[PDB]
């Protein structure tokens, strides 16, 4: 490995830390502001910008390096039954070390440039709840 | 000419020599016009460096070729990257003995020239030209590049460099065909400045009239009017002259140079940059005048000939600056106050110290927008070093005025070293004069700034006379505003303020009434309101204590535990409704207190009191109050119900108010 760095801030000078806001009515967290952690895919530290679709969901597998899996539940109308049917969709989003991850919470994600085959979104604001395991079902 | 170069190099290679033999490919690749930079950087700092054995056999032909490629105008593009970067590259990659042989090649006729003789000037030299000015421009740009790349290795080549550049400069100023000589003069002075701060160890004394002929004749009668726009190369030469120790006494030769420098500083229509530039010249002059033995080899002259016959003009001009225009840049301000700081210990007697003390207290009562607090600390150091001259016994109205300023700065500053210097300026205040009283203030403020056992001893000792009192009042309210180490400094300063206000209510003789009553109003009441807005709860408790002392001891003055708290608030409601209140009292003491009470049935009692007091107060203050409250709504999402209950009660109060005023 090499030394990690923000791309164009001059460190060893004998005479700062850059972090941008995404906007959209969001507030950068304090761990993103002052925490010396560094990553290129963070929208508040790296050069990734967020634009386009804004989505929500509930994390299912937080046991992964800075990427969560989101179950997207919705109600599918089948005409044959003329009834609504539950359908779960599995997304992904790059998780910043700025926030405190909780399993089962409610997380808002945002569309970015494709960082991986699955990672297309960045987390913006977690909402802490008491969400349970796979057996819990709810439209979100 | 590149074709003539190719044929010449073919002839030199026809001179079949073992020295040139291993380098012919480097020569032809240096010469091919598409391989120049790459061939250069493979020649130097490559594997096949020049072997030092036949280096004396290869270097002359290589250097003539390097001069040809640095002189070529055909293949060059424009800009600095057009041929200037090439010359800089060649001189950067060259070596110093190689540079000496190269400058021998570069100075054609001017190699063996003598600019100075056993006598001063050689007019027989200067009234004869050996070079066209185009070649002079080329030579001079070349030599500026040489010096800029050389640095400290100039020492074995001075006896040629200074002769060349001085001949060019003096022929230029005699020509003062104008464009060529103009660019000659400007780049000449630039090379000269670089040469000066490169070579300090040279002896510059055998020519002085050369600096005379360069400086005094064409410019000095016009120099402020000219340099009102920006800095110049002459100004750079004077700046590096003042930087160098041994070069400074060249300013004595014409005695009007430093007068005209501060005359440039006098012209108030400058771009402020020539102002701060002349100021830095003065900075280096004073640092030289203070510096040890290495500069005391010349200090005694620069004390007795350069600064001494012009201190009056210096201070008169600095005063004209600080009282001419209402607009002064912060850089000019900090830099001017820094110059007067460093000039303070360098003078012993003068004439304009009355003006100096007046301008000091003027810039000290200037608002915080115009003057930074660091700058106020600088004016304080100025005051300490400038007060000690024997002036205050005359013109006492100036002296009671400056004492009002130093007192005012006791509740303003934040820094321990600034407060130490405050105690020191008070010390020399007493040393100048009333004397024992102000010395009591000296020991009081000394044991205030000295640590915590000494401070509490100070508070108790003064706990155990108007001008005696006022600074103690200032530092007393500052130590009110200090929240807590253990809170003891706050409580003891509160007790001291009660002792002061007890002295206030003790003395009630009618001119003393007037004086002390205006003092206690104009220093205490805004400090009460500022401490009311202070969110420190120990500060609010002690300000409630001293406010209780005020209202209980004063009352002839015309302008004057949850359960017990709520009961006292109900008592305050009844006090309102038996007598409405004073409006400023309401709006600047009571409202912030219960605002703090809300945001820290207590809330219901608080908003009921806010309702009754919003009945009691004035509508313009109410208009600002309502704008501040809806701003609290928009900005504070922490207490939505709390702020909106406040809104409901206050506009119900508005409805009752308009219903009563109907």
């Amino acid at each position: 490995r090499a030394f990690l760095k923000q791309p164009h801030i001059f460190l060893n000078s004998k005479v700062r830390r850059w972090y941008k806001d995404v906007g959209l009515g969001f507030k950068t967290p304090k761990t993103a502001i002052e925490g010396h952690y560094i990553d290129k895919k963070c929208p508040f530290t790296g050069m990734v910008s967020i634009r386009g679709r804004i989505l929500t969901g509930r994390v299912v597998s937080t046991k992964m390096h800075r990427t969560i899996i989101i179950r997207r539940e919705y109600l599918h109308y089948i005409p044959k039954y003329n009834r609504y049917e539950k359908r779960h969709k599995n997304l992904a989003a790059h998780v910043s070390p700025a926030f405190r991850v909780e399993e089962g919470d409610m997380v808002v994600v945002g569309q970015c440039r494709p960082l991986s085959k699955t990672v297309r979104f960045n987390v913006l604001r977690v909402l802490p709840r008491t969400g349970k395991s796979v057996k819990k079902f709810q439209k979100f | 000419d590149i074709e003539l170069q190719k044929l010449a190099l073919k002839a030199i290679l026809t001179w079949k020599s073992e020295g040139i033999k291993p380098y012919q490919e480097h020569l032809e690749y240096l010469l091919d016009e598409a391989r120049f930079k790459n061939e250069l950087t493979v020649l130097f700092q490559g594997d096949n460096k020049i072997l030092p054995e036949h280096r004396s056999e290869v270097i002359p032909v290589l250097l003539h070729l390097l001069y040809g490629r640095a002189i070529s105008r055909k293949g060059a593009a424009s800009g600095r990257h057009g041929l200037h970067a090439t010359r800089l590259a060649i001189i950067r990659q060259l070596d110093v003995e190689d540079m000496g042989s190269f400058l021998d090649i570069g100075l054609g006729p001017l190699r063996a020239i003598r600019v100075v003789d056993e006598q001063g000037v050689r007019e027989s030299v200067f009234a004869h030209e050996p070079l066209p000015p185009r070649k002079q421009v080329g030579l001079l740009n070349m030599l500026e590049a040489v010096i800029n790349e050389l640095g400290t290795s100039v020492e074995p080549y001075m006896d040629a460099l200074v002769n060349s550049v001085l001949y060019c400069l003096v022929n230029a100023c005699r020509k003062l065909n104008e464009s060529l000589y103009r660019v000659i003069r400007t780049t000449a002075l630039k090379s000269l400045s670089r040469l000066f701060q490169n070579a300090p160890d040279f002896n510059w004394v055998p020519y002085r009239e050369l600096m005379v002929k360069e400086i005094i004749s064409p410019r000095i009668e016009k120099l402020p009017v000219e340099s009102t726009q920006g800095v110049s190369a002459t100004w750079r030469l004077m700046a590096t002259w003042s930087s160098l120790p041994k070069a400074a006494p060249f300013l004595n030769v014409d005695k009007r140079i430093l007068p005209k420098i501060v005359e440039t500083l006098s012209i108030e229509k400058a771009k402020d940059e020539v102002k701060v530039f002349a100021l830095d010249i003065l900075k280096n002059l004073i640092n030289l005048a203070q510096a040890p033995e290495t500069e005391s080899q010349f200090n005694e002259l620069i004390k007795t000939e350069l600064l001494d016959p012009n201190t009056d003009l210096i201070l008169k001009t600095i005063g004209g600056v600080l009282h001419g225009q209402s607009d002064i840049g912060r850089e000019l301000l900090s830099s001017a106050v820094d110059t007067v700081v460093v000039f303070a210990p360098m003078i012993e007697v003068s004439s304009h110290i009355q003006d100096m003390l007046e301008i000091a207290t003027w810039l000290l009562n200037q608002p915080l927008r115009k003057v930074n607090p660091k700058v106020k600390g600088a004016i304080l150091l100025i005051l300490k070093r400038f007060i000690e001259l024997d002036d205050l016994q005359s013109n006492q109205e100036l002296q009671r005025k400056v004492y009002s300023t130093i007192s005012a700065l006791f509740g303003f500053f934040k820094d321990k070293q600034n407060r130490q210097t405050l105690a020191e300026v008070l010390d020399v205040f007493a040393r100048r004069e009333w004397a024992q009283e102000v010395s009591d203030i000296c020991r009081g403020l000394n044991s205030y700034v000295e640590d915590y056992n000494t401070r509490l001893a100070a508070f108790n000792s003064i706990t155990k006379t108007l001008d005696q009192w006022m600074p103690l009042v200032h530092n007393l309210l500052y130590f009110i505003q200090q929240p807590e180490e253990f809170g003891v400094l706050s409580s003891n300063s509160a007790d001291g303020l009660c002792k002061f206000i007890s002295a206030v209510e003790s003395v009630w003789a009618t001119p003393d009434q007037a004086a002390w009553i205006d003092v206690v109003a104009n220093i205490i009441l805004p400090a009460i309101y500022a401490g009311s807005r202070d969110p420190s709860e120990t500060v609010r408790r002690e300000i409630l204590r001293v406010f209780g002392f005020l209202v209980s001891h004063l009352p002839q003055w015309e302008l004057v535990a949850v359960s017990r708290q709520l009961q006292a608030l109900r008592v305050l409601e009844a006090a309102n409704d038996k007598r409405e209140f004073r409006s400023k009292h309401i709006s600047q003491f009571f409202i912030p207190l219960f605002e703090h009470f809300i945001f820290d049935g207590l809330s219901a009692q608080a908003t009921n009191t806010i309702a009754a007091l919003t009945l009691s107060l004035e509508w313009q203050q109410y208009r600002a109050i309502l704008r501040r409250f809806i701003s609290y709504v928009e900005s504070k999402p922490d207490w939505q119900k709390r702020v909106v209950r406040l809104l409901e009660k206050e506009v119900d109060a508005l409805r009752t108010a308009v219903a009563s005023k109907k």
């Binding site: 906007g23 959209l24 009515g25 634009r51 386009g52 804004i54 | -």
Partner: protein
């Protein structure tokens, strides 16, 4: 080489222009939002008959678009481009109607001398100079410093100088250039931001009909001030 039916239905062709239809060439205006010069001459104006006739007319310097002579047959002239024909001395301007079709209007020189163009955007060009991009793909150097995006500019058309400007304003009258409610002259009454893409304006007519069009399709014509002669 699309068919006549697949050609856009707002530059009209009757049932006898053959199975084909010309495609516009590359130019300032967009492909869907264009009226080509041959269709303007021989299908709408009928000042000629045949492709060769229009070729000859456009080959001699006889048709001038936006103050400049246009040579080729299928030069696009989409929206509000004045067309000066000197042998008749007439000037034609392209507006829409309430249904959403190209409508040609006759004008003399006084109102034909200037154009009204919507500002696409504004930036700083090379050299540190602000420049201004219209929807006509015209770039104006050194503009008025108040002219933001979605402004409108009255343009001299002889020196290209910025003669006047009109501001995006709620309470102003507009004209729609896209969407399902395309071509409905009315007043802007409301703006909705919707930060995150596709801001909307709410625009009613002069006669009480509300509808939602997007800012990109909105084309400011004037508060009351119909600076171009709309057909009566």
């Amino acid at each position: 080489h699309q068919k006549r039916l697949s050609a856009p239905s707002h530059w009209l062709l009757d049932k006898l222009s053959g199975a084909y239809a010309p495609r516009p060439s590359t130019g300032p205006h967009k492909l869907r939002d264009c009226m080509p010069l041959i269709v303007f001459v021989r299908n709408r104006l009928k000042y000629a008959l045949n492709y060769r006739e229009t070729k000859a007319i456009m080959m001699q310097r006889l048709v001038k678009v936006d103050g400049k002579v246009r040579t080729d047959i299928t030069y696009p002239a989409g929206f509000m481009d004045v067309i000066t024909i000197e042998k008749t001395g007439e000037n034609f301007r392209l507006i829409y109607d309430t249904k959403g079709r190209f409508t040609v209007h006759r004008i003399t020189d006084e109102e034909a001398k200037y154009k009204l163009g919507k500002v696409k955007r504004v930036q700083l060009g090379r050299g540190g100079v602000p420049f201004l991009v219209t929807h006509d793909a015209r770039t104006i150097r050194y503009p008025d410093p108040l002219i933001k995006v979605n402004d409108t500019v009255k343009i001299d058309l002889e020196t290209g100088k910025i003669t006047d400007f009109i501001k995006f304003d709620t309470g102003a009258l507009a004209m729609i250039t896209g969407g399902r409610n395309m071509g409905r002259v009315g007043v802007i009454t409301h703006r909705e931001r919707h930060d995150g893409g596709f801001g909307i304006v709410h625009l009613k007519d002069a006669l009480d009909n509300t509808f939602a069009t997007r800012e990109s399709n909105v084309f400011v014509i004037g508060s009351e001030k119909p600076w171009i002669s709309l057909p009566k």
